[PDB]
């Protein structure tokens, strides 16, 4: 009973509040996609999908004080090895001839420890996810490279990468389980290169209590009163 144009109207104030709190390239993108929705039920759905995730990933960057990287400028695995572990990068090509798809894997966040974005403590991140998971039962999956059964060491430091996977989908467990299965092969590859990498993965959905997401509640309200409402109104009308 409501035409696309009318829906984008009723959801103008809820959406202005969304673009206001996002990072620039995030607000800027989610704004283009909302004008393709106003000028769109399929094509509109397709754009409202990308806003759902791009907006979540900007609030995720905000919550964790990380940097929002638009997909066009996210690094691949081969890019992180090339820059961060150049002495092994050629060997990172040899062992990836039967699985060259590995080279272009592109997570939401490809971090490395302060010698690809840089983070203070890779271990401090993994513990904050493990803490929330344990305290709120929020499904996460984590993996860590480990050549043979090697021990950590206190007399030398090593470069290391952090691979984060986030997502705003209704099947949370399936996403974390499917994310961890995709990085599993490359994690085993890193073990055989002597490269220390950690893979995190998590997901929220709109049924999660607002006080228990991976983004602050203030950003949950912003997401619910907009991207979600627009989706309800998009199926109804």
């Amino acid at each position, epitope marked *: 009973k409501k035409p696309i144009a009318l829906i984008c109207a009723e959801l103008y104030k809820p959406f202005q509040d969304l673009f206001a709190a996002l990072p620039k390239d995030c607000s800027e993108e989610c704004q283009t996609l909302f004008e393709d929705i106003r000028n769109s039920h399929a094509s509109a759905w397709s754009s409202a999908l990308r806003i759902k995730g791009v907006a979540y990933e900007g609030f995720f960057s905000l919550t964790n004080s990380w940097r929002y990287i638009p997909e066009d400028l996210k690094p691949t695995l081969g890019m992180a090895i090339q820059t961060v572990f150049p002495d092994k990068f050629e060997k990172f090509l040899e062992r990836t001839h039967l699985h060259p798809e590995y080279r272009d894997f592109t997570p939401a966040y490809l971090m490395c420890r302060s010698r690809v974005q840089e983070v203070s403590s890779v271990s401090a991140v993994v513990d904050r996810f493990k803490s929330k998971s344990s305290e709120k039962g929020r499904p996460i999956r984590q993996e860590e490279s480990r*050549p*043979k059964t090697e*021990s*950590m*060491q*206190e*007399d*030398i430091e090593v470069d290391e990468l952090l691979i984060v996977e986030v997502g705003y989908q209704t099947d949370i467990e399936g996403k974390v389980i499917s994310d961890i299965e995709k990085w599993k092969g490359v994690v085993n590859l890193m073990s055989h290169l*002597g490269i*220390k990498v950690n893979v995190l993965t998590c997901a929220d959905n709109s049924q999660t209590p607002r006080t228990d997401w991976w983004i602050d509640e203030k950003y949950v309200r912003l997401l619910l009163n907009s991207i979600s409402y627009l989706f309800k109104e998009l199926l109804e009308n």
Partner: antibody
Amino acid sequence: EVKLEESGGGLVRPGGSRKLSCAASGFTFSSYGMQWVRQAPEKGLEWVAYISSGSRTIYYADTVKGRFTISRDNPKNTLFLQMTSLRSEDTAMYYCATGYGGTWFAYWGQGTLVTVSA
Amino acid sequence: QIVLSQSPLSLPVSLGDQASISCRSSQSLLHSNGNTYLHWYLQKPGQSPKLLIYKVSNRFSGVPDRFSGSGSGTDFTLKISRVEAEDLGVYFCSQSTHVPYTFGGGTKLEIKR
């Protein structure tokens, strides 16, 4: 001078429990991984557990897994070993040790003797 | 687990002579960070163990220079250039490259008389 002073040994019935402590002095205890090692009478050295400086990493000998817990209270400069479901083969001298910058056993205590027997 | 094989089991040595103790590793002790975590300890009778050498060849502070270590990969040696009476005891090689950390079974150095 670096010093590690263990306490907590004595007699323990099979299946019983015991908590061993180790007091560190002479170095900034909070920055270094600490370890337990043991030695059964007339035998060799056997590693028991390692705990990182902020307790994030813990390693266990396969023979003590699920029975021994290692921990530390850094503002108190102390290292612990909770031992549970003890067997007669746990009869040993127990030592705390640290590398003071490595995973080797640079500094040792004098050991404390734990006898598990009825 | 990483098994460390010490030979000989016992080593009779006359005062002033050299001694070499040998530690063979069941796998390489080269750690991916570049270091080799193979270490040597002396336990004198009745006392707690003492670190002699760490990371193959670094002599620990306070350790007399008659003690040295060499090797790489899976083959390592401890040398006592000139044996003193005090060196009586059991010598242990240990690895901390891999979990579980492990020891050889010990070489008893006896003084020849």
